[PDB]
């Protein structure tokens, strides 16, 4: 129906904590083919991240049990893990479909482009977490490509403390460590990102500082974990 009605319903869904509905409303809004505002981008991202987040958490619980049994001591665990996986792949595919059909090519500015390319890398990363065989290889390649393009734009267009730039770098470092099994690249990126941002914090207002250091603390937390 009308785009404005879909946005209204997405915001109602959000207040109601109805994230599947929220995502479906935002999908309909994207499909109108107009750009999304900052607010609207965030509605889309929050909705789908809540949906995939539930599936990822469930998949991890089930995969852990499944792995713990395929050592020593029915098909139920496997079967249910497979069901949740298929669901997760469907949601990731839907998001990537929106990004490739509409959002990336229609974005009118640098910030939007980085936002959507990062999302592209993230949803490939979530696919990579559950993938095997040839699927996993092609997914990993796709994630790296998306993240790297986003990184190139962000380095040209955004200051080092910019929260979008910081969050992209954080997630790409997670990719390197968890997905690509490149711990050295992970640490290198996280440390460089942190150091180049620390350099500029003394120039920031209270609110800017809070937004930047939220992400910077996560880079730090990962560095502790990874060393």
């Amino acid at each position: 129906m009308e785009r404005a009605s879909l946005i209204q319903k997405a915001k109602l869904a959000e207040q109601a904590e109805r994230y599947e509905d929220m995502a479906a409303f935002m999908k309909g809004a994207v499909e109108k083919g107009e750009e999304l505002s900052c607010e609207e981008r965030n509605l889309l991202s929050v909705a789908y991240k809540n949906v995939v987040g539930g599936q990822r958490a469930a998949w991890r619980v089930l995969s852990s049990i499944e792995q713990k049994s395929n050592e020593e001591g029915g098909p139920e665990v496997r079967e249910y893990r497979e069901k949740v996986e298929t669901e997760l792949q469907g949601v990731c595919d839907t998001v990537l479909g929106l990004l490739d059909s509409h959002l990336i090519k229609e974005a009118g500015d640098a910030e939007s482009r980085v936002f959507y390319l990062k999302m592209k890398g993230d949803y490939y990363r979530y696919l990579a977490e559950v993938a095997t065989g040839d699927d996993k290889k092609r997914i990993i390649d796709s994630a790296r490509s998306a993240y790297q393009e986003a990184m190139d734009i962000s380095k040209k267009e955004m200051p080092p403390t910019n929260p979008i730039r910081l969050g992209l770098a954080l997630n790409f470092s997670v990719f390197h460590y968890e997905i690509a099994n490149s711990p050295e690249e992970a640490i290198s990126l996280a440390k460089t990102t942190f150091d180049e941002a620390m350099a500029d914090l003394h120039t920031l207002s209270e609110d800017s500082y809070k937004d930047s250091t939220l992400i910077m603390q996560l880079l730090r937390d990962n560095l502790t974990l990874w060393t």
């Binding site: 965030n42 929050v46 991240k49 993230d122 992209l168 968890e178 996560l218 990962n222 974990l225 990874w226």
Partner: peptide, 9 residues
């Protein structure tokens, strides 16, 4: 433990 990624508001 799993690595932390960027949060959503």
């Amino acid at each position: 433990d799993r690595s932390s990624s960027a949060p959503n508001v």
